[PDB]
């Protein structure tokens, strides 16, 4: 359907945003673990 191609930039951008948030959260969690070790 043409709806899929029309919204594909939005779907890909949303997936990229989700991956960015998840990676940032994991990074922050590891830094928090290092803080607790200290």
């Amino acid at each position: 359907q043409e709806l899929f191609n029309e919204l594909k930039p939005a779907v890909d951008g949303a997936n990229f945003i989700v991956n960015h948030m998840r990676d940032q959260n994991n990074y922050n969690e590891e830094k928090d673990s290092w803080n607790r070790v200290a």
């Binding site: 899929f4 779907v11 890909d12 949303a14 997936n15 945003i17 989700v18 991956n19 948030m21 959260n25």
Partner: peptide, 22 residues
């Protein structure tokens, strides 16, 4: 429609962001 893995992943991801900032 929602059978596509990507739209499903996008919806679950948006909910993940919302829960994370909550």
């Amino acid at each position: 429609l929602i059978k596509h893995p990507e739209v499903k992943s996008a919806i679950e991801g948006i909910k993940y962001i919302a829960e994370t900032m909550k």
